[PDB]
Every structure is written in structure tokens, then in C-alpha cells.
Specification:
The complex is a heterotrimer of chains A (103), B (80) and C (153). With 80 residues, chain B is α+β, with helices and mostly antiparallel strands. Chain B has a single domain, classed as Potassium Channel Kv1.1, Chain A (2-Layer Sandwich), CATH 3.30.710.10. In chain B, helix 3 crosses helix 4. The longest helix of chain B has 16 residues. Chain C has a four-stranded antiparallel β-sheet. Strand 2 of chain A pairs parallel with strand 2 of chain B, so a sheet runs across the interface. The complex binds nickel (II) ion (3 copies). One nickel (II) ion binds next to loops of chain C. Chain B: Pathway: Protein modification; protein ubiquitination.
């Protein structure tokens, strides 16, 4: 298994998949949750657009690299009428400054 | 199958219902809004859920010192 | 003495890496494929000893017993030179001491019986950063919780 965070705007999906499963199959997972078909989805590893036919392993999502405790991020962009929106992921909030004693 | 957990800052985390039930609080209470738990904390909570379910050789669960105090309070609140 | 022993065994139960009545054979089977330094504590099957450290070495799992005498824990003085041995009220402290000292006995990562609570994992993390619990922005109940287990492992 590979452990993933699928992220778009302010949405984050925690899910797992086989290293051997494909990008398309992951889109089918996204479609079940977020109700948008595969051809209205683009998935990314960082800035790299992921091809439907590649397995997750071939995209660089390995069980060593995508653990339950430290899932790998897949970016997600939807169709926006006649095009695709730009890939955009809202950062999580910033932690406060450490107390002094935690030096 | 899935539940939505919303942080104070409005980030929406979609996690397997089974995983979310790791929290006794969540188990007790489709969406849950956490008005007092920000996304840098809630995100790590969700990773904890995955880790706990998967490990129920258990690996280390690393926590940045910078989130540790808030995470402790959240974990205590969530009963996990 | 019983009060001290009670506190020590309470800490040991809180670790998540105390395996109780685990047999010698069970420990070796568990550590067989583990990385070097991986360790657990279990009961000793030997009359003279309370507890044993089972640890993976580069040559296979090995066992180092812990003595408990005069209200103090120390490593096996039959194996280690008695004069070079530190004595501890707390057996988790003993382990923590050796884990930190190689950050002599090579101990790295404990073998958990099950997944620790998130609360406990946060406690370990905070312990790595400070002993000054009184200065932390936490409710008293959570400070009390930190006070109960001050170790980094
Ligand atoms: Ni955005
Ligand atoms: Ni020795
Ligand atoms: Ni002591």
C-alpha cells in the first residue's frame, strides 16, 4: 500500500492505494468522493502532471515514500468550464512560536 | 465509508469513517466541525488515525516540536 | 520501597514496549529481522532477575538482564563490570539513560506491543524538548500527565 493525501484548494482526502494501481483508478476514487469524472480531473506529483496509465509506483509513490504517518501529497485540479483551473493547494495554518523552555 | 472533519480555519479533511473512530470523541459524536483545532494540527491527527489503524513492526510517529503542545491538547480532547 | 517499585512498574506499563511474560524464544523470533538496536523489555525467566532487555545486535538478538537490588535497577553485573554500573530507582530511566548515551550499550528504537496513543507520542516529543513542565501553556491536568512520564523513549 501507498498512503496518500489528495489535495485541492482547502480539501484533503486521506486514502491508500496499491503501488500497482493506476492514476486513472485513483481518479475513480476521487470521483466517488468528490463527484467529478476522471476527464475533469488532473493529478500531480508536485508540479508534474500524472498520466492516467502509469501506476502510482511509476509516478514515484512507493510504500517507502508514502507511509501512514507521512502520506505523500497528490495535487488535484478540476475542469473549470472550457479549461482546467490552475493547480492550487491552500497551505495548512502556521504553528505558533515555540515556548522558550522548548528551546 | 468517509467522514468530513473541518478545522477552525476551514480546511476539510475527508477520512475513512473507520479511521476517524480511532477518536472516542468523534465515535461518540457525516461532518464534524472543530472550532478549536487548526489545520496544522487536524492534518496530523488524521495521519495518526491512519497509523493507528494500520498498526492495530510499529514504526515511529514523528511530531514536530512546533505542533506538539497543540497536538497534545487536541489528542486529549479527541480521546486518542 | 513498594511505593518506589509501584512507580517504576507503572512507568514500565506506560512505555508500550514492555512485553510481560514473553518467552526467550518469542523475543528472539520477534527481533530476528528487526534493525540493529531494536529492543524490548520483558520478564526474565531467571530466578535472580526481574526483567530482561532483548535487543537486536548485528549478530542476532541477545539478552541483557536487569538486576533489582536495594530498591535499585542496574544492568547484569555478571555480564557488565559491576564498578561501571549506574543504579536507578526507575527502570524506564535506566533504559532512557542508555538510549541517550549513544545518541557501550547500543539501544535505538523500542519494539511497541501496540500503537501508542497520540497523547503519549506528544508527551515523548515534549520530553525531548524540555524538562521545564511548569512553564508550558497547558491546563494543570495535562501538566500532571507530562509529570507522570518524563522520558524520551
Ligand atoms: Ni488555492
Ligand atoms: Ni555491558
Ligand atoms: Ni532515578
Amino acid at each position: 500500500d501507498v498512503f496518500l493525501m489528495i489535495r485541492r484548494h482547502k480539501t484533503t482526502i486521506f486514502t491508500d492505494a496499491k503501488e500497482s494501481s493506476t492514476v486513472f483508478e485513483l481518479k475513480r476514487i476521487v470521483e466517488g468522493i468528490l463527484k467529478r469524472p476522471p476527464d475533469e480531473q488532473r493529478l500531480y506529483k508536485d508540479d508534474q502532471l500524472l498520466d492516467d496509465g502509469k501506476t502510482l509506483g511509476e509516478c514515484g509513490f512507493t510504500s517507502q515514500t508514502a507511509r501512514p504517518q507521512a502520506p505523500a501529497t497528490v495535487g488535484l485540479a478540476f475542469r473549470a468550464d472550457d479549461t482546467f483551473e490552475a493547480l492550487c493547494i491552500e497551505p495548512f495554518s502556521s504553528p505558533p512560536e515555540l515556548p522558550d523552555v522548548m528551546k | 465509508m468517509y467522514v468530513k472533519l473541518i478545522s477552525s480555519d476551514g480546511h476539510e479533511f475527508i477520512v475513512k469513517r473507520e479511521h476517524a473512530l480511532t477518536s472516542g470523541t468523534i465515535k461518540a459524536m457525516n461532518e464534524v466541525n472543530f472550532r478549536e483545532i487548526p489545520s496544522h494540527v487536524l492534518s496530523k491527527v488524521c495521519m495518526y488515525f491512519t497509523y493507528k489503524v494500520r498498526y492495530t513492526e510499529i514504526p515511529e510517529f514523528p511530531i514536530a516540536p512546533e505542533i506538539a503542545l497543540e497536538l497534545l491538547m487536541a489528542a486529549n480532547f479527541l480521546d486518542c | 520501597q513498594a511505593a518506589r517499585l509501584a512507580k517504576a512498574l507503572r512507568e514500565l506499563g506506560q512505555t508500550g514496549w514492555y512485553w510481560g511474560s514473553m518467552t526467550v524464544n518469542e523475543a528472539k523470533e520477534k527481533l530476528k529481522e528487526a534493525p540493529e538496536g531494536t529492543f524490548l523489555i520483558r520478564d526474565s525467566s531467571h530466578s535472580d532477575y526481574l526483567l530482561t532487555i532483548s535487543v537486536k545486535t548485528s549478530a542476532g538478538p541477545t539478552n541483557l538482564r536487569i538486576e533489582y537490588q536495594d530498591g535499585k535497577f542496574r544492568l547484569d553485573s555478571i555480564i557488565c563490570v559491576k564498578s561501571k554500573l549506574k543504579q536507578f530507582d526507575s527502570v524506564v530511566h535506566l533504559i532512557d539513560y542508555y538510549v541517550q548515551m549513544c545518541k557501550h550499550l547500543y539501544l535505538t528504537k523500542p519494539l511497541y506491543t501496540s500503537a501508542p496513543s497520540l497523547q503519549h507520542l506528544c508527551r515523548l516529543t515534549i520530553n525531548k524538548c524540555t524538562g521545564a513542565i511548569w512553564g508550558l501553556p497547558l491546563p494543570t491536568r495535562l501538566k500532571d500527565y507530562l509529570e507522570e512520564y518524563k522520558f524520551q523513549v
